[model samples]
Target: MRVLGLNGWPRDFHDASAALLVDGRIAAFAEEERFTRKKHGYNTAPVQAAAFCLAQAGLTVDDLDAVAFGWDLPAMYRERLGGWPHSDSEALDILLPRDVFPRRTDPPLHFVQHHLAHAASAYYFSGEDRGAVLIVDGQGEEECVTLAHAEGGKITVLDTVPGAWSLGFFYEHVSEYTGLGGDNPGKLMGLAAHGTTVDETLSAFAFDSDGYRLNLIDPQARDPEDWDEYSVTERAWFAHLERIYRLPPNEFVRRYDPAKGRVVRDTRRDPYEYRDLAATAQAALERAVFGLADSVLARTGERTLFVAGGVGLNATMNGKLLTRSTVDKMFVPPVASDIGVSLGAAAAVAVELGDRIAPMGDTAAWGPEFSPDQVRAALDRTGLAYREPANLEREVAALIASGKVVGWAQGRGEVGPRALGQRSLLGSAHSPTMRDHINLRVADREWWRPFAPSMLRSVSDQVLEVDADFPYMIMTTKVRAAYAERLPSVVHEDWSTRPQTVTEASNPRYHRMLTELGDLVGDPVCLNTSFNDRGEPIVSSPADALLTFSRLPIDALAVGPYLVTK
Candidate 1:
């Protein structure tokens, strides 16, 4: 049965999406955020994402058996409004088939709850008969957090909580307070990491018996929606944060502070004000997240648990969940936030819609495909030179052997934010400066953070410890002592690398690149990072790739057989 999962969390149009079990197989996936320039776009990308899926299958909206929404908006908007809080979809009596999609109206509509959808997405793809489930993230209706039990054909929700006192709220507030966009809480995570005392902050984010709450700054002003209704005291509290912790605005576009004489990173002081605030912010988030998950484990009898949500994006906190919780088996799909909501919705739809969900025991390849034509168009647009490669894998691998940072934009896109391979940057696993170079050339990242590596599955155990399939780069791991020298570019200064193991069965082209790279230097696996530079999404079209190649410090752009060199 053909199914379509629509991601209603708007931002860009089509690039921010994923397909959980595409065409009954975990085939391909993509997020519209990559197509649209904005990160986590502010508008619904249902059509854009759906269109790409249809394009992949050579089908149309008329071909779909079920059109499922990433969430049940009517149910959520009704439950969470808090007495007419106001949103466009809040008051509508019926969101018609035409209303959801003005152009297409062939398939029947399926509405899914935010957290239930997330829980189902994790458990369904998990192929586990019974498991404890936790869905924690920012507000997706009133249920910001939920715990459930899935057994047989029944999935029972064990517990739930309101969005107001959410762990995600802590991080979002801290991000805004520390002079970053409130929406980009990852920035707070980045800044807090730079502080001298990470343990102190980690404790603040840990779980206690009853519940977890931290107060580093005045709490009243942190809420995003005061609705211009803050008390005089609340306003004063915000004024204090601006005076104390706010970064000089001129870091990027929104963070740009004209008052500061130089770039925020270049500016230095004896003692940093915003840095401490970032610490406090991180402390509050880690405490809330770890505490919340631990509480779920404490309440549930099941030792293994499935987790999803925007809050699950925190790799450090997720690591804490693994090492500290009662849960022996913890699962969080790479697309933890609303962006992957489409996949969750589609996966859920497949189960309820009578489509076979053959056991997804391993692999995750649910996204759009890029034909040779699409790749060529992107190459030709940039006025860049290309060589029609004889052996794409060996040719690209040869370039990587020479220590050139190659933009390996080949094959179908992966779901969520990370570029598993199709949209990735490749470098030798043996370069000491790979982390620094990647942070500067590609991510435009903060100094304290690190880039990750994608390793060949054959020798994964030699370089890193992994009991399960981290097919997706959802967690961090330490580089092994024996193979650390063999793969230097993939390792971080702290001797760590966020790893994604690729196999020939799952990703043949990427696997080929690795096999060829290994043939050259006897070490397969290269440093893999997202294709775009900072503030931009992954490049989807050849035009986008060409644009990024011309603007960024990239050495080569690989779009299908046409490998464009500088």
Candidate 2:
């Protein structure tokens, strides 16, 4: 069985990707942003991604059994295309184009629902036949939250919440109000830690579970069929967001500023009040998600859980759910957001065709890879002084030990939003100022955000508080209090760290590098981050890696075996 899955329309700039399935296994998976060089590329077709997948599989689009796209318009919304109250420019109507897939002449088409595809991506790849799956995002068609059951290669959506009362939408609106509108939700999450107080003026009724909401109330009321009647017009959304919650749109509000929720004109006031709101938002969403997960666990008696959606990317919330709920094994795939939908959609099509897609055995190595010749060819064009080290792992490890940041670009790039070693910026985790230094010089962002550490899975128990593996940097656990000093750069203000566990099987070269670092420095971990500057996507090609190295304040560049230094 062969299936190609695609997500995103042109101008949708969020997460658009293409994936291929061959006999129930992922052959290739790549996001369009990696090839397009546009961060969260919008309104773009995954032609390059699709073409790369076909080439990797040694097959053409004509040879595929089917093509699965991860979103169903008619089946999801149940309304005419013109039913939207907002104009084409305001909404995504114009963004969702038709007939743009690559050479897709005659393959069987599978149009899967957004959340169902999300559910499939988590449960099917988790290697669990029977488990509970939860899907939460800004808005899917007209739905936002979904609770489903996956049993024996089948998924059944048990319940759903419509878009008008969506928690995901609530977060986006808050992010906008806080002045970090696009792709800045993660920043909001980090800001929560800096907050010292909570503002109760936001109205508790505006956000309470059973139905928590920080947005609005419709005069027409919610529909009896679980849909909101207020979705008919743009006025309902605005009124609810503005009048209902009374959330002020204020910029320049900091987490530690003395000004608490005061919107003044050209006055000297601190932004601490906004950080309180961010904290409140984070707490509200965490409680709501935990309540939902807890209720499902009690009802189903399932010990294993698979969670997907954009909200599933919340590491703090995920950690709380595992610790507070009855779920023993919680699985969150690397691309728990929109990109994972492609893989999920492809799996659904393969399952319908009598293929039993099991949980993935490894990281899947599903992205594009450049060979030694290609790497060398790209480097030769730059005319920079470079050399092949006798032992690449030892040399790079020594550089990191000496407190030099290295741009490490290896085989294939990762599929999700994270770097995960293949496309990473590496530095010593031992330095206390490393996080702030890298934040200013390399990442070119705020210093409050904490960096992550990549360590060998063999020694994970010695450093992190949790016993579970964190392969995709999805969850956070406290750095063991005693090891905090040893790994200062990756440790957060709250003594927590999001560590990616590396094993020899998943990434042998990276694992070896960590092992070598451990032998040299007695701590087998490196401060790892994506190799990109602020407002840019992670470097995809050798040229991108080298160019970023030259532009940024980095010490060395490693693309394949060749190393170039300033």
Candidate 3:
């Protein structure tokens, strides 16, 4: 069966993407944001994205057996926007043009529910025979959190918390309440590490076996019932959070001062107060996430667990679930966000078609790749000093070991949010000062945020406390007691790090780079981060790579075999 999956269509949505599943295997998956160069181009359809998937499979739209959309448009319109005084159907018509369909024909279109698609994203690709599934997000239709059990390739939704109890909203509100943008959850999570009064913040929310309760929403601007309309819902919560945190009206620093993006991280006073709130919010979220995972596992007696949703990207919380829970194994898809829902919805259709399905292992390289000519043509136009090194891996490895931040843009770009090795900024994970360099200069990110490590799989066990490999960089684990001092750059305040375990077979160039670094520094790990500047998506093409390299403070660039330096 040839299934094409898509997410984001209507204007003003986010993470628009396309994925192709043939015989239950993912053939191609890429986000429209990559091609469009727009940060979450929700208003635009993934026209180029769909075309790429078709080209990858050597098939045209006429060959598609089914089209799967992660969102249930009809259900959403009926349940939420039915009485809204707007042309909803016209909106839908404009959002999904007829030509967007496979060969402009009405193929079997399956509109999977948002949360169910999230569950399927992790559960179907988990490869585990039986498992408990948890899906949490800002709002999935009317649900904010969902609990389910999966067995025999089917998911049974046990129950759900209505949108009123949305954890994602709380995080979103608090992020802005503390002067960071709601989209900057990664920064908020990082700042939590510096918090001293985390317990004070955790007390604001109560977690039950099924879900959580937090009276953080404001009753003035919006009702408790309409939690899915986050644009209005967020306004009320932002106002309410100020009182909860005891920040004065202007002192609360609601919303990012527009155009002051980079300044928000570095310019701040009495930042610990905000950090404490972040820690508290993070604690509450982690408690709720694990509470649900634990209860579902206990209720279903499942030995394995599958997690999905925007919250699934919280590697810190994911690591806690793995170490603190009794579940034998946990599967978290790399693209756990809505960007991945396209693949999940397609996988759901594949299951209905009786196609053989398996876990998506080491398949983060499912996005677009650049050709040699593409890279060469891009570099020639840069007018920068460059060379094609005979030994690219060893040369780049040496540059990194010498304390240089190298922009490493190799083969295919990564699918969801993480950079991995394909589109990454590589630095030595040996010095604490190196973290500041990447944070302040290359990344223009919060100084409190820690960096991830890409470590060779053979030697990873010696540095991190993990029983299984984390190739996707989705799960966090504690730094081994002995290696904390040596890998100071990657270690977080809590002594935890999200390490991408690299294997030669998966990415030989990166694996070779790690091996050479080990020969040079005796540690088979390097600091890894997404290769893009502040407010930019990960570089998608060689042209994007060159532009970012020239824009950022990175000292060196490695696009395939060619190296460009200032």
Candidate 4:
């Protein structure tokens, strides 16, 4: 059976996503953001994503099987209730498929509940037909939160968590406080690892009787667009967050500064107290998440797990949480949040209700890839001098080895917020100054946020703490002493890297590129960042590349065989 699933979000950002699962295997999945170019995107069912999902399975909309988009009447009402008056400026809506994916008479569509999708997405991977499955994150459906138990391929949702403590809202605010937002939450998380003090008033939250919130709340009883009712207690809790949780003044101008939340003016200041606080918040978050995960694991002794959703992307918490819990293997889908949901939903609908996944192409190539002709056309249109090198890995890696910051556009674009290697800006890992240069000239962003390092899987152990593959930079680990100074920009102050393990399996081309670079440097790692400018989403087309390239000052721009200097 062929199944199709759609992620209700990222539809407006042009990540309009859908996935195909053939006999339980993932066929294809993509986010609307890459296609639409709007970051954070909006809620609308993406026909584009749906089409990609179908294409993964080598079929069209007319292909066999059932399709389902996200469903939640309460959330629909809440989303409308609390949202601002319809913006005349906005046209795309991913939540409603009529805008992009028009309903068809054939290939019937079913509306799957949001919570169930999350539950199934989690449990199906857990290797348990029935056990406790906790869906923890911001809001989903009208529920905002849900805890479910899975058995025999069926999931039964139990407790409903309130949306007031939206994990996304909490993380976003804290990320904003750290001066990173709109797909840069990873930056803030990276910065936090370097922080000694946990700004309890910022990115951290507590879950005891007096739930301490360092995040955003629906102050106006709004966004009821998805929420149904608000009790007096919930209202009071919201008010407390608004009124309390103020950062206390320290020798540093400690305030709830959005950037570097509760910034301690002095970087030289003692981080002892701050580390404790940060540790407290980190501890609290882990506990809350554990409270949910443990509940399910105890009921079912299944050791294997597949975790999706935005929260699943947290590598540190994920790394630590699994170690302390009963579960042995934790698999977090590369694009766990809305993007992954699109894949999950499609796989759910197409495959027969079973344990195995229908087979399809590796999800690594879900995005678009320009042909040699297409790349040439882009360079030609831009009026840039070019080189048509047949051996790109050899030629480009050689240039990078010589200290050139290369703009690499090869193969298909990456699916998630990360650039991986396809849509990426590469530089030598030799000098830490490479980071400063990329931030000022190429990326134009804050210096505090660290960069990701692409290391050949063979040598990944020299720096990071992960035993498994981190092909997508989805998880993080601390850097060891031996390789800290050599890759300072990629390593946080605490000596760690959000390192990506580059092997032939997950990203062959990127790994090959790194391998060639490694031959020159005697090391298989180099600093890598997203393929776009600051505050902007990843470059989707050659048009976007030329646009960003023309504007940003870089040493070299590598577009297929051509190289441009700006």
Quality of model 2 by C-alpha lDDT: 0.77
After superposing candidate 2, which stretches have Cα over 4 Å from the reference?
11-13, 76-105, 197-201, 204-215, 219-248, 251-273, 362-364
- In candidate 4, what are the lDDT values of residues 151-236, reduced to their tens digit? 66666655666655655445544433322332444554555555454444433354443123424454334443234333322344
What TM-score does model 4 achieve against the real structure?
A: 0.78
> How would you encode candidate 3's per-residue C-alpha lDDT over 199-316 as one tens digit per residue?
6434456677754566554322334344265766566566556656666322432455569663254324444458878888888888888788888888888868888988888888
Judge candidate 3 against the unseen true structure and give its global Cα lDDT, from 0 to 1.
0.80
Query: Any idea what lDDT model 1 has?
Result: 0.65
lDDT of 2 at 115: 91
Poorest stretch of ten by lDDT in candidate 2: 88-97
Ranking by lDDT: 3, 2, 1, 4
lDDT of 1 by residue, 1-566 (tens): 77777665432222246453555665446666655666665564444555566667766556667767676665644443344343433211122124433334446667678787777677777767677777877656555678777766456887776554466655565555454656666666656655644354433333466345434333333334432112222334345445553353323233445786544433233223466676666665666666666666667677777888887877666665676647677777777887767777777788786765655444554555568887777666655678887787888888877878888776666667777887788876777777677667555776555567787888887767555566777776666776767676665444556688887887888988898888888877788878886668777766777787777777787877678887
Off by over 4 Å in 1: 9-28, 79-106, 198-207, 214-284, 359-364, 441-443, 482-488, 492-494
Off by over 4 Å in 3: 83-104, 198-203, 215-236, 249-273
Tell me each candidate's TM-score: 0.83, 0.88, 0.91, 0.78
True-vs-predicted CA distance for residue 466, candidate 2, Å: 1.5
